[PDB]
Structures are given as structure tokens and as C-alpha cells.
Design a protein around this ligand. Structure first.
Ligand SMILES: CC(C)(COP(=O)(O)OP(=O)(O)OC[C@H]1O[C@@H](n2cnc3c(N)ncnc32)[C@H](O)[C@@H]1OP(=O)(O)O)[C@@H](O)C(=O)NCCC(=O)NCCS
Ligand SMILES: CC(C)(COP(=O)(O)OP(=O)(O)OC[C@H]1O[C@@H](n2cnc3c(N)ncnc32)[C@H](O)[C@@H]1OP(=O)(O)O)[C@@H](O)C(=O)NCCC(=O)NCCS
Ligand SMILES: CC(C)(COP(=O)(O)OP(=O)(O)OC[C@H]1O[C@@H](n2cnc3c(N)ncnc32)[C@H](O)[C@@H]1OP(=O)(O)O)[C@@H](O)C(=O)NCCC(=O)NCCS
Ligand SMILES: Nc1ncnc2c1ncn2[C@@H]1O[C@H](COP(=O)(O)OP(=O)(O)O)[C@@H](O)[C@H]1O
Ligand SMILES: [Mg+2]
Ligand SMILES: [Mg+2]
Lengths: 1033, 249, 131
């Protein structure tokens, strides 16, 4: 939306960026004063404050300051301080707004004559930007629109300097035309480049010395942040005078800014007992209207909305803000929270409601303390589960929560809570329409196909998808129970070329790239309708889209829309949601009623209302919430007038702009003859004390004529069927419809049952209707959770407890929290087994492999595959052999002799060089640790006895490192106290010891791979002189 | 020799100096005695990469293999062979990507936009569930360690600026654990003071980072093999209803 | 099915039509019923590539592995894992190189010289002893 900026902000930007031949005087000569000003520091930074007399005024978006005695003119610094004494910090009432004077601007006094005061203004409209000039500027200009010279700079047009002199400066003093024309030219370029929508300088002063910008009022298109961030810097958008800025508002605004989802919050009365948390720009206004209609204006605490499928986390952060805000101070009659919404098109109701429920749980104490009662009404994707969790949190916390769904009228919960009631082209789509979807939106495509199938269409409505991040491929979808393939293209040109039958493109590009992809689409003549989904495209860019579309005859639906729906023919993306809603609202066959709305959520509420009151929807369009919709209310109303199948039209209008007046004009002109039912949302705005920007970017009344009240009155006077309020909309639709049946205008068609689609497996399990057995079973790690879990221990706890590699291995291999000495011993084993040179089988193979130019994994596994028998097997072999002997009860001497008889050598005994008097250091290191830390080492003791015997045969028949690790590991499993004998025995048997060697040695092998690569070693070929070739003859 | 030597350091000295697994890896992979914070960080990486459930390409393969009655080595390697591109490759990919971008001198915003134009996604950015306000604990554990013990983190600093940009598009476009390990490892090689730039760059290129993932995950994979054996799990055959047979005529 | 099907062709039909290993490879790799000269050529390639002694990177690794008392699969794969770049990669490399050169439209002399300038040797050219 367009947001007002401070005078200081505007002047700083102007001085920084304007480009003119005109010498602009007093550049950056302003000083800001607040109740916290350090005057010593202010004077040090602004010594010019003592150089001449000054002007002081508040900079708080207060209009007509001079007429309020709020401009102190031609004062010394002492005079300025005296002028501020009774004003700074003081309350002020300007119209129906009451606030405190806390922000003032001090600037040099500019002596000038009244004849040297000029008026300049630039403002945006659909058709371009108007430039206004008047030679009689100042605090007494009056009606500038009538008086001032005006000039329209077209959407992609340039401002001709000769036209400035010719049309605008007609009455300007001759000696000043050159300088004014230069300044205005520069000002216009500045306005464009920084995405302004309104820029007024009243007065602009021109003396013998040059140009002075005495006053500045402006609005910028805040949605252009992604463009202008660099130039704008940390731009601040002040609240209207009379309203305060709250940190909770800034927090929500920051969340809004960081996502495609819409998150809006404005505090009206922090002490109010009525709080809302409603989904949608449309519904939020309707709920606010209802609350105010029921006399709750004084107690309504906030205006806000959430929409555009926010996540559970975003909804949680939003809800916790509201809950914190409503538990600041107690109200004698307790408080109410209204959690409402339309039947959503695509927002996940379960995900969003789970976020709210989590916030309710976190604030249950304060909510109970503040006597809060909650009312819920919602429909949409997974709403059943959403409603269940709401009901459940009420039960568990004891907070009273009243939960309703699709069967309850949207606004009924308001009356309950307040105690009033007990608890271009005429045809766009056909049954033949084919579309290309820009973006990876598989869910929306499947929903369209489910609709196409129940509509009994011959073919799917989606011919192809365009997604630039992936290569060309086919994506699997369902046509009934049949699996089908839809092509996905990297380039739009390929999709168009291959699908000349496509005349529609549904653009799911984000706001950042929707402009360029829409402009790209319009280079393909085949495309006659484009739906633009994204919310937040700068207005200046949308105007360029409109210009091109109009000149190419392309109908644009959007931006900032869910799209629309033509029962029996075509559905734009998420419009109408899932099959349950398509079937419930009989959207699979057409009725006689056509509608147009700005709101997506409300369009699906209209589907519901119309299906219950009439023969159903013929065609519905959501034009979107932006200031300049690609196609307007009138554009669609005319199509409906010219569509014979349409017998009555429903228009859900809105505060902001003057579009609806075109309907009045069309009726008066006799162009519109079909009955039209219309209700404009936003009647609450009339009752608010300050200006309010609602959810929709375009929903803000800049003139009296743009209010919902004004439009509703005009429409009613023009002959449109206007209800008393939104509550009576259904009633009026039914009345018009019944009169049309009675007059034989409509002949309701006999209802035919539609094709049946199978339930997706996903939902079926969720509602527990089916059961499918798991083919797999795990017990060591769980990644599904909010945290990684290793054998029952969360990853943070693993680190907090300083488990280390050894500890993690205890968890993943054994599912045990091992003693710290056991962990350390495991790490010790991995260290002694890390490597043993390049000569051994595995290292050799890894090296050959790395030299054969292979990758790390291939080289490592090539060497790992040698592990097992003759190489690396001894640890397991020794452990098994000694364990068997020990457990058999044979004494070490009996064992030694038994082995000799059986013709077997003892595994883990012997060394090529290490003697009994010349020990293996790896054995020493480990033996010493084991003896010092293990509670018992019975098998090691037995093995050392066997070593005593063997070393008395030959001195090198020592217990080697494989034997030492083997028996110590058995002693560890058996005597660390974490394992039963059965468990210890099982782990040895399944080869946990082989795991130790493999894991340990993998370090050495990866080391060798890296080494060969760094040593730049060439391909190996074994020498022929080392090979005996003994071939046949 | 009379003693085992790891990159000039005897095995007893390795133990005496309390090198640990991290320290040993320092000698065998890089032939350097790394600062103790660097050793501890390596050990930390090997711990966060240890496992991530049985659903992942590699784990699944190891399980199938174990269930098909094979040995530890066969089962482990069958799984390890999936590691490389779309599985576990992200650490290397992220490190390489960010290192290039940083060193090119482009600012994070220029980098973000360059990728978008080139039609490439940023490696090491994004998560299916973790938001900017709902963090990945593995990322926290490591990020916090590094911030506390790394003297300089220029590339991490750069990556966190890129994270600042991406998360302000969609909140789940966070710097994931593969991106966090990737850039931190680069910062370690470059700023621990044990490597020349040339050396640090060579090690990244020859895929020392792939080694980290492979070595780390080998623990989880062996874990799974043992688990399946202990769970006395039968031979797997994939169900026909999960296979679309699109044969010629 | 009631019969094994290879790329749309039943196993009995495969034998009846005397497809051979080349023919079967045609179905399973390409899903094509190749001309009989093409089948025979494939079989021929598989025969000339069967072995080249125990000195080569792969054979050596299999041997080491077999000698380290491992199984057929482990021994075979340990060797296969060397295939790919400096060992056995030349077929792909040569095909790709020449196909690029040909399709680029450069004449053989231009190609020969392009490689020399680029400091690259031609894949599939050269022999240690054969003249
Ligand atoms: C006798 C001789 C030829 C060979 O014997 P040796 O190398 O000491 O011993 P061996 O190679 O036979 O092995 C010694 C024992 O260790 C055993 N052994 C070896 N490795 C073992 C292991 N890992 N686990 C268990 N037992 C093991 C062998 O079974 C053998 O047992 P045994 O003595 O009960 O038969 C040798 O000792 C010799 O040359 N002696 C000198 C004799 C001399 O001076 N001759 C006169 C010249 S004038
Ligand atoms: C616009 C919309 C349809 C899809 O957008 P989305 O899911 O937020 O975003 P995308 O899937 O296009 O991805 C967002 C961005 O992240 C980028 N991105 C994603 N993963 C990335 C990664 N790993 N590395 C780098 N960039 C990455 C994408 O390139 C894209 O960039 P861009 O925005 O500059 O084009 C969606 O945001 C939406 O529904 N918004 C609500 C609009 C609305 O309310 N409409 C009106 C209904 S009435
Ligand atoms: C000149 C000499 C020293 C070395 O040359 P050589 O071994 O025949 O050739 P090289 O090693 O330089 O290779 C020959 C060419 O084949 C090219 N080549 C080699 N393998 C190739 C391949 N696979 N693909 C493409 N080109 C290849 C080389 O690039 C080189 O190209 P160039 O000649 O255009 O630079 C040698 O030929 C010689 O001794 N000549 C005798 C000279 C003499 O009599 N001296 C006087 C003594 S009194
Ligand atoms: N620096 C200044 N030097 C001289 N006159 C000034 C200066 N600032 C304001 N004025 C005079 O004060 C009048 C009222 O202030 P202005 O900035 O136009 O506020 P507003 O439009 O809210 O009444 C101007 O029309 C102009 O005549
Ligand atoms: Mg003024
Ligand atoms: Mg919205």
C-alpha cells in the first residue's frame, strides 16, 4: 500500500536525489527536535541554527499547521526554544484525532513575498501521474484540483519540458519559467525513481537566489521496498496523527515484510475488550463492520488480518502478539477473542489453527486471569482438524472456546460474543480451456484436475508447467484414479511452442518476478488471459502490465488474487479449494448467478452463499486487492451482461477508489439491464477517528466518495439491490433469484450426480479409515521430530552431556548411554586403528583407485571391500576365539594345547618384530587405560595368561593390538554394566567389532585418498616382472 | 618404525598430547597439528552428521542390503555409494559456491541475484520445516560453537548475510546444516592459521568436505546394519503398487 | 506377468527370435529391437573388452581383494570402482570428444590444431607399441 512519510524523510530524499539545473537552497538545513533532544549536541551538529532566523513546526502528518498556530516563523534560536516550551510534549486535538506533539522540525527562515510562493503536486492514478501547478501557492490555495494547471504523464510516457512551460507555467512570472520548468522536470524524475504515489510542495518558493522547498507532504509505495531499499534506507512510515505507534505493530509489519503471506496489525484501542484474529483482508473488514454495527466500536481493540497461507510458526508468532496485547490489564466484564474467516481457498486451516492453539496454551494462565472467551468460525483446507484442535485446547485449559464451521454464517459468532443472539473478450474460459502454470505448484494443479474430472471435462485443464530452476521433465498427476503426466519446462518459449492449444497462463511467480514473467507471457499471442496470483507487486509496475495487456487485448485477472472459477469449465489454481468444497457448494455444474469480488476468501464464501440461495454460480472472478486491478469490476460486469447464461450479477465491493460508480453509470446509460446485487465492505472506516489502511492494498479511501457508505448509497439510488449490511446479503440474493424464477427468467436445471474421485491415501489414514502395514523397522535414530534424536537422547542433550564420538557410537550402535570410560575407550580404539600405512590390502586398493582418477567414495569403498577375512578380521576372530575358550571353562594352558591339536593358531597372538621385552606401544596405551578404568577385565586377564604361555615358546608370540582390542571390547560390553550377557554376546556375534575396525580405518583410507590427490599421483599399472603368467598352451 | 607415526607424530605422543579423533584426522588428512578448537569442531561435525534416520537414500540402501543377508562392509558400502550428488553432496557444493561468491568480491545481494538470473538455487540454503524463528538445532549447536571459538568467520558472516536476504523472501530459506558445516569448515581451513590459502583451497577442491560427511555418516550406517541384524529383519521386496510400469508395446 | 517381459518382448519370443545377449542388451538398455548387425557388434565389443591382463588398475584391485580372502561380489566391485576416469573412461571420452568435434563442423585438421592450442591430447588416439 501507499504509505505516508514524514516531511523530514521526504526532504532528505529530495535533497539527496533530485537532479536539476536549478540551485536548490538550504539543502539538508533541518534539525529534528523531540522531548529527548540533547540541545548541546543538536547545536554542535547544526551550527547554522545560529546563522539566521528560523521556522519551527511539528512533523507528525498534521495538515494545515499554520492555520493551527503550529508554525513559528522568523524566530531566533531563543525564540524557537520559547515557542517549543508550551508545545513540546503537549496534547493536541486536530479534528477527531488527539495525540501528543513530540516531533518538530527547525529550518532557516526564507524571506520572500507572497508572489514568490508556488504550489506543485504530483499524484498517481490508473492512467498515469498528474502534475499540478499554481502561481498562488501557500497556506491559502483552496481547491487546487479546480484552480491549478494539470498535466497527465502517461504510464510509460516522459514529461516534456516544453509541455511544462506550455500547459503548466501559463500564469507563472516570465523570469521564473526557466527555473520552475527545470525544477519540476527533476522533481518528476525523483518522484518516479523513488516510487512515490503522492508528492506535494506547498509552498515552493523561488526568489532571486533560487529554489526553496518550504513544505513537503508525500506518500511512497511501500511495496517497492525490494527495489528502493538502497535509496530509501531505513525509511519510517508514521501512524496518522491521533494514533500511536506500537512495537507489536512494528513486529507484525516486519513478519509481513519477510513473506508472501499477509500479516497485518493496527491497534485501535489497546484497552478494548473486543479483539479479533481474522483471516483475510475482506473478512477482517466484514467482521469489524459487524462488531461496529452491533455497537462495539468503543471496545474494538484492533484491526488486522492474516492470509496467503502463513505457516504454523508465522500464525503462532502472530497469535502470541495478540494474546500478549490482550492480557496487559483486566477489564471488569472480561474480554472476547474473535477467530474468524471465510471458507479459505488454500490457507491450511489445520496448520494455522495449530499455531494459534500453541499460543493459547502458552498464555492459558493470563487468558484465564483476564476472563477471555474465544469464538471460532472457519472453513477451508483441513478445517475439520483445525476445529478439533481448537475445541481440544478449550477442554484442556478450561478456557471457554465456541467452535463453528461452514454451517454457521460467517459473522454469526459476533452476535453470539456480544450477547445479541444465543450460542476485450466476453468469454474467458470454456470446458476446452487449456492453461500453462508458471511455478512449481503441484497441489494447485491437482486441485484443478480434480475439479475438471467432476465437471466431466474431456481433458485436464493444465497442459504444462513452467519452472526455471529445474530441467525439462514430466510430473505425475491423477485424472480420476488414473495416473497421468504433465510436462514441466525450464523455458516458457518451449512450453508455448509445444502447446499452441493454451490460451491461459496462471502465474504463481513471487512478487519479485511476477512483473517480468507476466510481461514475457504477453509476447505470446496465443495467451489471451493471465491470472497473476502474487500480492505486493508495486503499483507502478502493475500499471505497466495494464498498459501492455490493454494494447495486446489480454485479460489480466489479478494481481493479488486467488483467481476465479467457472463451474463446469475451468478453475483458476486454488480457487474453490478441494473436492469437499467443490461438491458442497455445487461448483461442478453452473447455475444462473455470476459474481465479482476483490477478495479471494470472500469469493469462496460467495460460492457457499450462492449455492444455498440460488441454482448456483455461473462464473465467479476475484479481481484482487491491489489499487489497480488488471481487470476491474466493470470489466467483468459487462462480460456478465453480455453472457446469455448469466441471469443475475453479484458484486462484493470495497472501500477505496471509485470503481463501483461505473456500475451506476452503466445502469443509467441502459447498458446494464440484468439485476445487480451489490454490497461494499468497509463501513467501519467511517466511524474510526484516524485513517485506516485495511488488508487489501487498494482498501483506503482518499476521498469522501471512496467510502463504503458513500458507494452503497449511490448504488442503492442507481437501482442496484443493496442489503442493509453484509448479514442481509444472502437474503437479498435469494429474493432477487426467487423473483427471476417466478418471472421465468431462470429455469433451474434438474440435478445430475457428478463423477466420483477416490480419497487420497493421506486423508484416509488421517481419519483412520484404512490401515497399511509398515515394511520397515528402525530403533536407533528419529529425524521426524522438532529435534534430532539418537536412541532416545535429543541431539542438544548429546552435546550438553559432552558425549563425544564414543558416546554417539554407544547410542547409535548399542542404544545405550555408556559410562564415560567406555566412550573414551571406544574413541581410543578408533584412534589406534585409524591407519597402518599404505602397504596393507585396503590402503593399497584405495591408493590405486585415487590414482585411477576416482572420487573419494569410490576410492574409500574400493579399499573397504578388502576388509573381512585375511585383512581386518582379527579383532572379531580374537574376541570370538578367546570368548569361546573362556566361557567353555578350559584353563589357558588347556586352550593353548587344544588349539595346537585342532591345528589352529591363536587369533590375536603374534607380531613380526615386537617381542615380550620390546612391546607394541598401541597395546601398551590401550592395556594401561583398560586396566586403570575398567571395573573388571576377566577375558583380558585370561588372554594375558595365554600370552604368558605363547611367549615362552617364541618371544614374539605377544598379545597383538587386534587381540588386545578384541578381548578388551568383550570385557567392556560384559562388565561396563550397560549390557546383559545375552546383549553383549549378540553384539559380538553380529560383528560390532568389525564395525570398530571399518569405522576406525576409514579415516586412514580417506587420508590416503586425499594424499594421492594432493601428491598428484598418476595412473598405476602393475609391473609385468612381478607377475607370473602361467597360461594354457 | 618401532612406533606408529601419524604425519610425523608418534602414536604415544598422539595420546600424550590428548589429540583425540579430531586431532588424528588433522594429521592423517591435512598433516597438521590443528588448534584444539579446530579438532573439537571437526569432532562436532562428525557428531551432527552421524545419522539422520533410515529414510535417506544411503541409510535405506544399507538397510535393504543388511536385510538381504549381507555383511557389514557390503551393507555399509552399498549405502555409502549413494553419497555424492543429490545425497550428502550439499556440504561440498555449499562450501564451493559461497567460497567462489565471496572471493569474486560480489556482495551477498549481487550473489543472490546472480544465482536467480543463472537459474540456480543456493546450496546450503533452505529447510522443509525449520523457519528463521524455529531453528535447526544442529545449526544452533555448531553456529554457537563457532561464534564462541573461531577467531575469524568471514565466509560464515557472508553466508549469514545471504541467509538474511533469502529468509526475507520465504522464512524457511535458512542456512541449513550442510551450508553451516560447509562455510564453517572453509573458515576453519583459511583462518585456523595451519594452512596457506593455496592449501586451504586445494583441500576443499579435492573434497575433504565429502570426507567429513562420509566418515561421519558411516557411524549411522553401521548403526543401521547392526540394528537390522538385531531386529532379525527379513528380505525386502519393493511393493508393486508403488511402481509405475511404463513398458513399450 | 505369466511371462517375463523385456522391454515389451516376452522371454519366449526373445529366445524364438534368437536375440542373443546383444539383442537382450538392446531391449534392456535402449528398449529397442536393434538390427542383427548392431546386436552382433555389441556382443563383439563385450568380447574385445572382456579382459586385458592383471596389471591394469581394476584387475589388480580385484586380485588383491580375492587374495585378501573376500567373496566374488566384493572382489569384483573393488575392481569395478577403479573404472571411470583414467581407467576405462577413454571409450566415453573419445566418443564425446569426436562427436563434439564432428558436430561443431570443424574439419579434422582444425580439430587436431584446436586440441594442440587448448593443450589437450586426443582421447582414443595413441598406443604404447602399435604403429
Ligand atoms: C625348531 C625351529 C627350527 C623352528 O621352531 P620355532 O620358529 O621356534 O617355532 P615354530 O615356528 O615351530 O612355532 C613355535 C610354536 O608357536 C606356536 N604358534 C605360532 N604362532 C602361534 C599363534 N599365533 N598362536 C598360537 N600358537 C602359535 C606353534 O604352533 C609352535 O608350537 P609348538 O612349539 O608346540 O609346535 C627353530 O626353533 C630353530 O631353528 N631352533 C634352533 C635349533 C638349533 O640350534 N639347531 C641346531 C643347528 S646346529
Ligand atoms: C507467490 C506464491 C504463490 C509463491 O511464492 P513462494 O512459495 O513464497 O516463493 P517461491 O516458491 O517462488 O520462492 C521464493 C523465492 O525463493 C527463492 N529460493 C527458493 N529456494 C532457494 C534456495 N535454496 N536458494 C536461493 N533462492 C531460493 C526462489 O528463487 C524465489 O525467488 P524470487 O522470489 O526472487 O523469484 C506464494 O508466496 C503465495 O501464495 N503468496 C500469497 C499471495 C496472495 O495472497 N495472493 C492472493 C490470494 S487472494
Ligand atoms: C622432436 C623430438 C625430440 C620429440 O618429438 P616426438 O616424440 O616425435 O613428438 P612429441 O613428443 O613432441 O609429439 C609429437 C606430436 O604429437 C602430438 N600428440 C601426441 N599424442 C597425441 C594425442 N594423443 N593426441 C593428439 N596429439 C598428440 C603432440 O602434441 C606433438 O604435437 P606437435 O608436434 O604438433 O607439437 C623427436 O622426434 C626427435 O628426437 N627427433 C629427431 C631429431 C634429430 O634427428 N635430432 C638431431 C640429432 S643429431
Ligand atoms: N523556512 C521558512 N521560511 C519562511 N516561510 C516559511 C518557512 N517554513 C514555512 N513558511 C511559511 O509558513 C507557512 C505554513 O507552513 P507550511 O510548511 O506550508 O505548513 P502547512 O501547509 O501545514 O500550513 C508556509 O505557507 C510559508 O509561508
Ligand atoms: Mg503548506
Ligand atoms: Mg490476503
Amino acid at each position: 500500500s501507499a504509505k505516508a512519510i514524514s516531511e523530514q524523510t521526504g526532504k532528505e530524499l529530495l535533497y539527496k536525489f533530485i537532479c536539476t539545473t536549478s540551485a536548490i537552497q538550504n539543502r539538508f538545513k533541518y534539525a529534528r527536535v523531540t522531548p529527548d533532544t540533547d540541545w548541546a549536541r543538536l547545536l554542535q551538529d547544526h551550527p547554522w541554527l545560529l546563522s539566521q532566523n528560523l521556522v519551527v513546526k511539528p512533523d507528525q502528518l498534521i495538515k494545515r499547521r499554520g492555520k493551527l498556530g503550529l508554525v513559528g516563523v522568523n524566530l531566533t534560536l531563543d525564540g524557537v526554544k520559547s515557542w517549543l516550551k508550551p508545545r513540546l510534549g503537549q496534547e493536541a486535538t486536530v479534528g477527531k484525532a488527539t495525540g501528543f506533539l513530540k516531533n518538530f522540525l527547525i529550518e532557516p527562515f526564507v524571506p520572500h513575498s507572497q508572489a514568490e510562493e508556488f504550489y506543485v503536486c504530483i499524484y498517481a492514478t490508473r492512467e498515469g501521474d498528474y502534475v499540478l501547478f499554481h502561481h498562488e501557492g501557500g497556506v491559502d490555495v483552496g481547491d487546487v484540483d479546480a484552480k491549478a494547471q494539470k498535466l497527465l504523464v502517461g504510464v510509460d510516457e516522459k514529461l516534456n519540458p516544453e509541455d511544462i512551460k506550455k500547459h503548466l507555467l501559463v500564469h507563472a512570472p516570465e523570469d521564473k519559467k526557466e527555473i520552475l520548468a527545470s525544477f519540476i522536470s527533476g522533481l518528476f524524475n525523483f518522484y518516479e525513481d523513488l516510487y512515490f504515489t503522492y508528492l506535494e510542495i506547498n509552498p515552493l518558493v523561488v526568489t532571486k537566489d533560487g529554489v526553496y522547498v518550504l513544505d513537503l507532504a508525500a506518500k511512497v509505495d511501500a511495496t517497492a521496498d525490494y527495489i528502493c531499499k538502497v535509496k530509501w534506507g531505513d525509511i519510517e512510515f508514521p501512524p496518522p496523527f491521533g494514533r500511536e505507534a506500537y512495537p507489536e505493530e512494528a513486529y507484525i509489519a516486519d513478519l509481513d515484510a519477510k513473506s508472501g503471506a499477509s500479516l497485518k496489525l493496527t491497534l485501535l484501542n489497546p484497552k478494548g475488550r473486543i479483539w479479533t484474529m481474522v483471516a483475510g483482508g475482506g473478512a477482517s473488514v466484514v467482521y469489524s463492520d459487524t462488531i461496529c454495527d452491533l455497537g462495539g466500536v468503543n471496545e474494538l481493540a484492533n484491526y488486522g488480518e492474516y492470509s496467503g497461507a502463513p505457516s504454523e510458526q508465522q500464525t503462532y508468532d502472530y497469535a502470541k502478539t495478540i494474546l500478549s496485547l490482550m492480557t496487559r490489564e483486566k477489564h471488569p466484564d472480561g474480554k472476547i477473542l474473535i477467530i474468524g474467516g471465510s471458507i479459505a481457498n488454500f490457507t491450511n486451516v489445520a496448520a494455522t489453527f495449530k499455531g494459534i492453539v500453541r499460543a493459547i496454551r502458552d498464555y492459558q494462565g493470563p487468558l484465564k486471569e483476564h476472563e477471555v472467551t474465544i469464538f471460532v468460525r472457519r472453513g477451508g483446507p483441513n478445517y475439520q482438524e483445525g476445529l478439533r484442535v481448537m475445541g481440544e485446547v478449550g477442554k484442556t485449559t478450561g478456557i471457554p472456546i465456541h467452535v463453528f464451521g461452514t454451517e454457521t454464517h460467517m459473522t454469526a459468532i459476533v452476535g453470539m460474543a456480544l450477547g445479541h443472539r444465543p450460542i476485450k473478450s466476453t468469454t474467458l474460459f470454456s470446458r476446452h480451456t487449456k492453461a500453462i502454470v508458471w511455478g512449481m505448484q503441484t497441489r494447485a494443479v491437482q486441485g484443478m484436475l480434480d475439479f475438471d474430472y467432476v465437471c466431466s471435462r474431456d481433458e485436464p485443464s493444465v497442459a504444462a508447467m513452467v519452472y526455471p530452476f529445474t530441467g525439462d521433465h514430466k510430473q505425475k498427476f491423477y485424472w480420476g484414479h488414473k495416473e497421468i503426466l504433465i510436462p514441466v519446462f525450464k523455458n516458457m518459449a518451449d512450453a508455448m511452442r509445444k502447446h499452441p492449444e493454451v490460451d491461459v497462463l496462471i502465474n504463481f511467480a513471487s512478487l519479485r518476478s511476477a512483473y517480468d514473467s507476466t510481461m514475457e507471457t504477453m509476447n505470446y499471442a496465443q495467451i489471451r488471459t493471465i491470472a497473476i496470483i502474487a500480492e505486493g507487486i508495486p503499483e507502478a509496475l502493475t500499471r505497466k502490465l495494464i498498459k501492455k495487456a490493454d494494447q495486446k487485448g489480454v485479460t489480466i485477472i489479478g494481481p493479488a488474487t486467488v483467481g476465479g472459477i467457472k463451474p463446469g469449465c475451468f478453475k483458476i489454481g486454488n480457487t474453490g479449494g478441494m473436492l469437499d468444497n467443490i461438491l458442497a457448494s455445487k461448483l461442478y455444474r453452473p447455475g444462473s448467478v455470476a459474481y465479482v469480488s476483490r477478495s479471494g476468501g470472500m469469493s469462496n464464501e460467495l460460492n457457499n452463499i450462492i449455492s444455498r440461495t440460488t441454482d448456483g454460480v455461473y462464473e465467479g472472478v476475484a479481481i484482487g486487492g491491489d489499487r489497480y486491478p488488471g481487470s476491474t469490476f466493470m470489466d467483468h460486469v459487462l462480460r456478465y451482461q453480455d453472457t446469455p447464461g448469466v441471469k443475475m450479477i453479484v458484486v462484493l465491493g470495497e472501500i477505496g477508489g471509485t470503481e463501483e460508480y461505473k456500475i451506476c453509470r452503466g445502469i443509467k446509460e441502459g447498458r446494464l439491464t440484468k439485476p445487480i446485487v451489490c454490497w461494499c465492505i468497509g463501513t467501519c472506516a467511517t466511524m474510526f477517528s484516524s485513517e485506516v489502511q485495511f488488508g487489501h492494498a487498494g482498501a483506503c479511501a482518499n476521498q469522501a466518495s471512496e467510502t463504503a457508505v458513500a458507494k452503497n448509497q449511490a448504488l442503492k439510488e442507481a437501482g442496484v439491490f443493496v442489503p442493509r449490511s453484509f448479514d442481509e446479503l444472502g437474503e437479498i440474493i435469494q429474493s432477487v433469484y426467487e423473483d427471476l424464477v417466478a418471472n421465468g427468467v431462470i429455469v433451474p436445471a434438474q440435478e445430475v450426480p457428478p463423477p466420483t474421485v477416490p480419497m487420497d491415501y493421506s486423508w484416509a489414514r488421517e481419519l483412520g479409515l484404512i490401515r497399511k502395514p509398515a515394511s520397515f523397522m528402525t530403533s536407533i535414530c528419529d529425524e521426524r521430530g522438532q529435534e534430532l534424536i539418537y536412541a532416545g537422547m535429543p541431539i542438544t542433550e548429546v552435546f550438553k552431556e559432552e558425549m563425544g564420538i564414543g558416546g554417539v557410537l554407544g547410542l547409535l550402535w548399542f542404544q545405550k548411554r555408556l559410562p564415560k570410560y567406555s566412550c573414551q575407550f571406544i574413541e581410543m580404539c578408533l584412534m589406534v586403528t585409524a591407519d597402518h600405512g599404505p602397504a596393507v590390502s585396503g590402503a593399497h586398493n584405495t591408493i590405486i583407485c585415487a590414482r585411477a582418477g576416482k572420487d573419494l567414495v569410490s576410492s574409500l569403498t574400493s579399499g573397504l571391500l578388502t576388509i573381512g577375512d585375511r585383512f581386518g578380521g582379527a579383532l572379531d576372530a580374537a574376541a570370538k576365539m578367546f570368548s569361546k575358550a573362556f566361557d567353555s571353562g578350559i584353563i589357558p594352558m588347556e586352550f593353548v594345547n587344544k588349539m595346537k591339536k585342532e591345528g589352529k593358531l591363536i587369533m590375536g597372538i603374534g607380531h613380526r618384530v615386537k617381542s615380550i621385552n620390546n612391546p607394541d606401544m598401541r597395546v601398551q596405551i590401550l592395556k594401561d587405560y583398560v586396566r586403570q578404568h575398567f571395573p573388571a577385565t576377566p577375558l583380558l586377564d585370561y588372554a594375558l595368561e595365554v600370552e604368558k604361555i605363547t611367549t615362552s615358546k617364541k618371544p614374539n608370540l605377544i598379545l597383538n593390538v587386534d587381540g588386545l582390542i578384541g578381548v578388551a571390547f568383550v570385557d567392556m560390553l560384559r562388565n561396563c554394566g550397560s549390557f546383559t550377557r545375552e546383549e553383549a554376546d549378540e553384539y559380538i556375534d553380529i560383528g560390532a567389532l568389525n564395525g570398530i575396525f571399518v569405522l576406525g580405518r576409514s579415516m586412514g583410507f580417506i587420508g590416503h585418498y586425499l594424499d594421492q590427490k594432493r601428491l598428484k599421483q598418476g595412473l598405476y599399472r602393475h609391473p609385468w616382472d612381478d607377475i607370473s603368467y602361467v597360461l594354457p598352451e
